[PDB]
């Protein structure tokens, strides 16, 4: 499920929605021979709890 940055500014005061956070501690890295990358990911939100 993916939400939007426009809806995070119009959500009703007392309506609690869930927004999932990604882990990624256990993920095998790519092989030595493969195509490179170009200007990648931008993340827009952060919890302050934790």
């Amino acid at each position: 499920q993916h939400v939007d940055a426009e809806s995070i500014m119009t959500a009703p005061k007392g309506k609690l929605f869930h927004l999932q956070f990604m882990d990624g501690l256990l993920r095998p890295e790519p092989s030595a021979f493969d195509p490179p990358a170009s200007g990648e990911d931008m993340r827009l939100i952060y919890p302050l709890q934790p």
Binding site: P35, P36, S38, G39
Partner: protein, 49 residues
């Protein structure tokens, strides 16, 4: 940087892109010298095509 390019010869289309992607995220000012163009002045209304 003020990276200037004389000729686009061995421009691996991946790294030939990565320069432009860095213009919009680091204020990189790039250059080209082998390009010819005949751009012309345009009026307010009618705009671009």
């Amino acid at each position: 940087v003020h990276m200037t390019i004389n000729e686009r010869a061995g421009m691996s289309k991946l790294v030939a892109d990565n320069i432009i992607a860095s213009v919009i995220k680091s204020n990189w000012v790039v250059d080209i010298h082998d390009i010819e163009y005949t751009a012309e002045v345009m009026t307010p209304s009618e705009g671009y095509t």
